[PDB]
Amino acid sequence: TIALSEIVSVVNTSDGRLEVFGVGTDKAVWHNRQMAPHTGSPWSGWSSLKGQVTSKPVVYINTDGRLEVFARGTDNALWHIWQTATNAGWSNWQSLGGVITSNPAIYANTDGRLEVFARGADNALWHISQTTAHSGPWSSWASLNGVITSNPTVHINSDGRLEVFARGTDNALWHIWQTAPDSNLWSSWESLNGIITSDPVVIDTADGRLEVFARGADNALWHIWQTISHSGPWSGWQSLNGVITSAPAVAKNCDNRLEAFARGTDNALWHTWQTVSHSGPWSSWQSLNGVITSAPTAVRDADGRLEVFARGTDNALWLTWQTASSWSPWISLGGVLIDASAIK
Amino acid sequence: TSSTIALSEIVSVVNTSDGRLEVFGVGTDKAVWHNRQMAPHTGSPWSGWSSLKGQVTSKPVVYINTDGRLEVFARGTDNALWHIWQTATNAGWSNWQSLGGVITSNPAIYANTDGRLEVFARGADNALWHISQTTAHSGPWSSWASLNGVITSNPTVHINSDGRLEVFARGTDNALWHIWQTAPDSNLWSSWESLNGIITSDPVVIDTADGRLEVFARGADNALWHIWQTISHSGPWSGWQSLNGVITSAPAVAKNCDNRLEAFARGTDNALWHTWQTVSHSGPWSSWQSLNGVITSAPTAVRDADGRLEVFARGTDNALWLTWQTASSWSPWISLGGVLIDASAIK
Ligand SMILES: CO[C@@H]1C[C@@H](C[C@@H]2O[C@@H](C)[C@@H](O)[C@@H](O)[C@@H]2O)[C@H](O)[C@@H](CO)O1
Ligand SMILES: CO[C@@H]1C[C@@H](C[C@@H]2O[C@@H](C)[C@@H](O)[C@@H](O)[C@@H]2O)[C@H](O)[C@@H](CO)O1
Ligand SMILES: CO[C@@H]1C[C@@H](C[C@@H]2O[C@@H](C)[C@@H](O)[C@@H](O)[C@@H]2O)[C@H](O)[C@@H](CO)O1
Ligand SMILES: CO[C@@H]1C[C@@H](C[C@@H]2O[C@@H](C)[C@@H](O)[C@@H](O)[C@@H]2O)[C@H](O)[C@@H](CO)O1
Ligand SMILES: CO[C@@H]1C[C@@H](C[C@@H]2O[C@@H](C)[C@@H](O)[C@@H](O)[C@@H]2O)[C@H](O)[C@@H](CO)O1
Ligand SMILES: CO[C@@H]1C[C@@H](C[C@@H]2O[C@@H](C)[C@@H](O)[C@@H](O)[C@@H]2O)[C@H](O)[C@@H](CO)O1
Ligand SMILES: CO[C@@H]1C[C@@H](C[C@@H]2O[C@@H](C)[C@@H](O)[C@@H](O)[C@@H]2O)[C@H](O)[C@@H](CO)O1
Ligand SMILES: CO[C@@H]1C[C@@H](C[C@@H]2O[C@@H](C)[C@@H](O)[C@@H](O)[C@@H]2O)[C@H](O)[C@@H](CO)O1
Ligand SMILES: [Cl-]
Ligand SMILES: [Cl-]
Ligand SMILES: [Cl-]
Ligand SMILES: [Cl-]
Ligand SMILES: [Cl-]
Ligand SMILES: [Cl-]
Ligand code: NA
Ligand code: NA
Ligand code: NA
C-alpha cells in the first residue's frame, strides 16, 4: 500500500496556460486547460482524449513544446498520445508495448529524448526511450533490475544525469542513476534507508540538488537530499512533522522557496513552506481548508503563483491558488474523476 | 546605412547549474576574466575576478550546455571563432580551442531542442554564418555554413516556444530583419524577412510567459521600441510600439518573478533608468524611472535564484558595479572591482 495518490497530472504549457489530465468514470483520459495564461483564468471544461487506461495518466512536455501523455492500457502495455503541434490537436493513441505494473514516470534527457520508467511483472524497473529528440520511433524495452514496491519517480540532476527513486522491498527509499547524460550506463541500486509510506516526490533545488519527500512510518512528511549539487553524500532523513493522510505534492514558488501540500487528518488541505528564501527554514503546517478526497497536485502558473488541485467530496476537481494576502476560496472545475493508479 | 550601434553591454551573464550568477568580460590584457557569486542569493559575496586567459577581439559570450557545463565563445586574434568550456559541470575549464571560420561580429549562441549548441556570427562576406555541435553538448562541431543576408549589427538568436531557433539582426536599410528554422534541430531555414523600423542598437530578444518572441531596440529617435509575435503565430508581428525614453546605450531586458518584463538602459545623464510592466505579464508599461549611478556601458540584467533582478554596468572607474531589487526599492550601487573594456567586434 501507499498514501492516497494525486488524481491529476498537471503542467504549465508552452503558451503559459495550465493543463490538467485525469481519468473519468469511463476510464478515458480527460483534460482541462486555462484559456488565458494567468491565475484565475477561465477553463476549457473537461473533454475526453478517449482511450481506456489502467494507470494514472502522466503528461510530459517534449523539448519542442508538444504535450505527450503516457498511461498503461487494458492490455498492460504502455500507451501514449501526443500533440501534433503546440496549438493543434492530438495523435491517435499508440502502443509502446511492454507489460508494466506501475504508473509511468517520464523525463527528457539532455539530448531531448524522452525516457519512460515503469515497473514490470517481475517487479524490476524497466525503461524505454525515444530514439531521437522529441520523436518516435522508440527503443526496445530493457530492465534496470531491482525489486520495487511503489510507483517510481524520475528527475534529472544538475549535470544532466537522470535519477530514478522508488520504495524497495524493505520499505526504504532506493535509487539508481545514469552515470553520464543521455546514457544507457547506470549505477547500482543503492538504499537511502528510511521507511516510506507514500510514493516519493523528487524536486531539484535552486542550488542544483535533488531533494526527495515522502510520508514516513509515523505519517509525518519526511525529506532527504543531496548535500552537493548533483552529488552525494546525502543528508540523513529529516522530519517536516505533520500528520498526513495522502501523498505529498511539492512545488517551487517563483523565488524558489519550496512548498509542500498534503491532505490532513481532518481531510482538509494543509501546507508548509520555506520562509525567507530557498535556503530558509520550513514553516509550521497550516490549513487551507476544503474537504478533499485525493492528494493535492501543485503547480506554479504563468503569473508565478502556486495553484493547487484536489478531488472534492462530489468527485469533481477543485482548485485554490495564492493571492497577495492569502489563498483564494476553493472553486470547482466540475468533472467526475477516479484514482486509476496502477499501484495503490 | 548605419555603421554604429548604441553602447554595448560590458559583460555576458549566466545562471550556473547551481543557481549562482557568473559574469564574463574582457580585461585590459584582452583576456577573458570571470567572477561569480559565492552563494545563490541576492547580495552574496563574490569570488572576485580570475582569468581564463585567451586574447579576444569580440565580446566573449557564455552559454550553458544542457548538461550544466558553461561554454564561452569569442572571436580570436586570427578572426576564427574560439571557445573554452567546463570539462565537468561547474568545475574545471578546458584550454581555448579554435572552431575556425572567419567572423566579423560577436557570436550568438542557442541550444537546439536536441541539446546541440549552435553559434551564429557575421562572416567575412557580411552574411550570417553558423556552426553547431554534432551531438548534444559535445564536439566535434559541424561544417560552417551560410544563411546569406547582409547584416550590420551583432546577431541575436532565441528559440520559439515550438523549438525553432530564430535569429535577428540589423539590415543594410537599418531595419530589423530575421530568419528562422522551419523545424527544430534542422538546417532548413526560412528566407530573410524584414520587420521594418529603424534600429540604432543591437536587437534584444526575449520569450514572454505566453510563448512569444519580443524584440527590443533603440530607435532612430533614441527611444526604446519593441515589437512582438502575435498570439496566433500566423505570420504577422505586432507593428512597432515605442516605450519612450531617451537612451544612450543598448537596452537590457529581464523577467521578474511573476514574468513581468522590465527594461533597463543608460539615460542622457549617464544614469541607469528602467521601465517595467505593471500588474501582470500582460500589463501596460510604466513610465521611466532613474536608478541613479553613472555608468559607462549598457546595463546587463538577470534574475537571480531568489527571484530578484540584478543589474550590472561598468562604472566611471571601469570596474563592474551592481544594484539589485529589494522589497522596497533598489540597493545602493556597489563595486565588484575589475578593469573591463568593450571588445565588441561591432560598435
Ligand atoms: C478504436 O480504438 C483505438 C484504440 C483505443 C485505445 C484504448 O486505450 C489504450 C490506452 C489501450 O487501453 C487500448 O487497449 C484501448 O483500446 C482508443 O481509445 C480509440 C479511440 O481513440 O482508438
Ligand atoms: C543483492 O542485490 C543487489 C541489490 C538489488 C536491489 C533490490 O531492489 C531494491 C529496490 C530493494 O527492494 C532491495 O530490497 C532489493 O534487493 C538489485 O536488484 C540487485 C541487481 O541489480 O543487486
Ligand atoms: C462554506 O463552505 C465553503 C466550501 C468548502 C469546500 C469543501 O471542499 C471542496 C474541496 C469540496 O470537496 C466541497 O464539496 C466541500 O464542501 C470550504 O471548505 C469552506 C471553507 O471556508 O468554504
Ligand atoms: C455536463 O457534463 C459535462 C461533462 C462532465 C464530464 C464528467 O467528468 C469526466 C472526467 C468523466 O468522468 C465523465 O464520465 C463525467 O460525466 C462534467 O462533469 C460536467 C461538469 O460541469 O460537464
Ligand atoms: C599559448 O597559447 C595558447 C592558446 C591561447 C589562445 C589565445 O586566445 C584565443 C581566443 C585566440 O585569440 C588565439 O589566437 C590566442 O592565442 C591562450 O591564450 C593560451 C593560454 O595561456 O594558450
Ligand atoms: C537579393 O536579396 C535577397 C534578400 C537579401 C537580404 C539582405 O540581408 C538583409 C538582412 C538586409 O540587409 C537586406 O537589405 C539585404 O539585401 C538576401 O541576402 C538575398 C539572398 O538570400 O536575397
Ligand atoms: C513599418 O515601420 C514604420 C517605421 C516606424 C518608425 C521607425 O522605427 C522605430 C523602431 C523607431 O526607430 C522610429 O524612430 C522610426 O521612425 C513607425 O513606428 C511605423 C509607423 O506606423 O512605421
Ligand atoms: C519630465 O521629463 C521626464 C523625463 C523623461 C525621461 C527621459 O529618458 C530617460 C531614460 C533619461 O534619458 C531622462 O534624462 C530623459 O529625460 C520621461 O520620459 C518624461 C515623462 O513625462 O518625464
Ligand atoms: Cl500506506
Ligand atoms: Cl514536463
Ligand atoms: Cl548608433
Ligand atoms: Cl503599455
Ligand atoms: Cl526618476
Ligand atoms: Cl573600453
Ligand atoms: Na510555461
Ligand atoms: Na538489464
Ligand atoms: Na561600427
CA–CA gap between residue A8 and residue A22 (Å, rounded): 5
What is the strand order of the sheet B309-314 is part of? B300-303, B309-314, B320-324, B334-335
A268 burial type by CB count under 10 A (0-12 exposed, 13-18 middle, 19+ buried): middle
Q: Give the number of the atom of ligand 6 that is nearest the alpha carbon of residue B152.
A: 12
Q: How far apart are the first and last CA of chain A?
A: 5
Single-letter amino acid code for the residue at B253: V
DSSP string, B157-216: EEE-TTS-EEEEEEBTTS-EEEEEBSSTT-S-B---EE----B-S--EEEE-TTS-EEEE
State whether the beta carbon of B79 lies less than 6 angstroms from ligand 5.
no
Q: Does the Cβ of B197 fall within 6 Å of ligand 7?
A: yes
Match 481519468 to its residue by C-alpha cell.
A23
Please return the burial class of A132, using the count of CB atoms within 10 Å of its CB with bins 0-12, 13-18 and 19+: middle
Cα–Cα dist B3/B9, whole Å: 18
A277 grid coordinates: 528564501
CB pair distance less than 8 Å for B68 and A112: no
- Is B136 within 8 Å of A112 when comparing Cβ atoms? yes
Residue-level length of chain B: 347
Angle ∠(B246,B248,B254) on CA atoms, nearest 5: 85
Q: What are phi and psi of A147, to 5 degrees?
A: -140, 100
Residue B314: name the closest of B121, B59, B107 by CA: B59
Could you tell me the CA-to-CA distances from A82 to A90, A106, A301, B195 in Å, in that order?
5, 14, 22, 34
Alpha carbon separation from A109 to A116, A132, A178, A285, B114 (Å, rounded): 10, 10, 10, 36, 9
Q: In chain A, which residues have their Cβ closer than 8 Å to the Cβ of B17?
A: 158-159, 208, 229-230
Pairwise CA distance, residues B215 & B167, whole Å? 11
Q: Three-state SS string across B270-326, please?
A: CCEEEEEECCCCCCCECCCEECCCCECCECEEEECCCCCEEEEEEECCCCEEEEEEC
Q: What span, in angstroms and rounded, lies between the C-alpha atoms of B199 and B153?
A: 10
**ω into A233 cis (within 30 of 0):** yes
Alpha-carbon distance A20 to A299, whole Å? 10
CA distances from residue B180 to A56, A64, A70, A87, B104 in whole angstroms, order as listed: 38, 15, 31, 19, 21
Expt. technique: X-ray
Cα A230 to Cα A196: distance, rounded to the nearest angstrom: 23
Contact residues, chain B, for A203 at CB < 8 Å: none
| B288-291 CB contacts, 8 Å cutoff, 24+ apart | B288/B244, B288/B245, B291/B264, B291/B323, B291/B330
CATH code assigned to B12-341? 2.120.10.70
Whether residue B77 has its Cβ less than 6 Å from ligand 5 = yes
Pairing between strand B32-36 and B21-27?
antiparallel
Q: How many CB atoms lie within 10 A of CB B77?
A: 11
Q: Phi/psi of residue A60, each to 5°?
A: -140, 150
- The pick from B153, B172, B178, B192 for probing ligand 6's pocket by mutation, whose C-beta has the most ligand atoms within 8 angstroms, reads B192
Q: How many CB atoms lie within 10 A of CB B26?
A: 26
- Answer whether A9's CB lies under 8 Å from A56's CB: yes
Angle formed at CA A112 by CA B163 and CA A163, multiple of 5 degrees: 140
Using the CB atoms, write b or e for B181-200: b if 16+ within 10 Å: beebbeeebeebeebebbbb
Ligand 2 binding pocket includes A313 (Cβ within 6 Å): no
> What is the C-alpha separation between B117 and B112, in angstroms, rounded?
6
How far is Cα of residue B244 from the mean position of the Cα atoms in its chain?
22
Buried b (16+ CB within 10 A) or exposed e, B220-240: eeebbbbbbbeeebeeebeeb
Instruction: Give the residue from B149, B201, B202, B199 showing the smallest Cα distance to B178.
Output: B149
Please give the Cα distance from A266 to B168 (Å, whole number): 57
Inter-residue contact B273 to B247 (CB < 8 Å): yes
Give distance in angstroms: CA of B33 to centre of ligand 3: 58
For residue A282, give every residue at least 6 positions away whose Cβ sits within 8 Å of its Cβ, in sequence order, or none.
A240, A272, A273, A274, A275
CA–CA dist A316, A203 (Å, integer): 28
What is the C-alpha to C-alpha distance for residues B171 and B197, in angstroms, rounded to an integer?
10
Residue B177 vs residues B7, B167, B220, B263, B325: alpha-carbon distances, Å: 20, 8, 16, 22, 34
Question: Could you tell me which chain A residue has the CA closest to the CA of B159?
Answer: A64
Identify the helix (H) or strand (E) that includes residue A269. Answer: strand A269-273
Q: Is B289 annotated as a binding residue?
A: no
Q: How far is CA B158 from CA B167, B175, B199, in A?
A: 7, 18, 18
Looking at the DSSP bridge assignments, the partners of residue B81 are: B75, B100
Cross-sheet strand order for the sheet of A317-321: A297-300, A306-311, A317-321, A331-332
- CA-closest candidate to residue B197, choices B179, B171, B166: B171
Q: Retrieve residue A151's grid coordinates.
A: 510507483
Identity at A90, one-letter amino acid code: W
Structural domain spans, chain B: 12-341
Q: Cell numbers 566573449 label which residue?
A: B60
Alpha-carbon radius of gyration of chain B: 19
Cα distances (angstroms) measured from residue B86 to each of A168, A306, B52: 37, 35, 11
Cell numbers standing for residue A44: 476549457
Q: Is B80 in the pocket of ligand 7 (CB under 6 A)?
A: no
- Residue to probe by mutation, ligand 8, list B218, B288, B289, most atoms within 8 Å of CB: B288
Q: Tell me how far the alpha carbon of residue A57 lies from the centroid of ligand 1, in angstroms.
A: 14
Left, alpha or beta for A221 (phi > 0: left; psi -120 to 50: alpha)?
A: beta
AA identity, residue B69: R
Among candidates B19, B41, B67 on the partner chain, residue whose Cβ is nearest the Cβ of A160: B67
Among A170, A176, A212, which residue's Cα sits nearest to residue A193? A170
Cis amide prior to B140 (ω within 30 degrees): yes
- Residue tagged 565563445 (cell numbers): B73
Give the minimum alpha-carbon distance from A119 to chain B in angstroms, rounded to a whole number.
27
Q: Which residues contact A59 (CB under 8 A, 6 or more apart)?
A: A9, A10, A11, A19, A21, A31, A67, A68, A69, A70
Ligand 1 binding pocket (C-beta < 6 A) is A 50-53, 71, 73-75, 79, 93
Task: Tell me if B107 sits within 8 A of B121, measured CB to CB.
Answer: yes
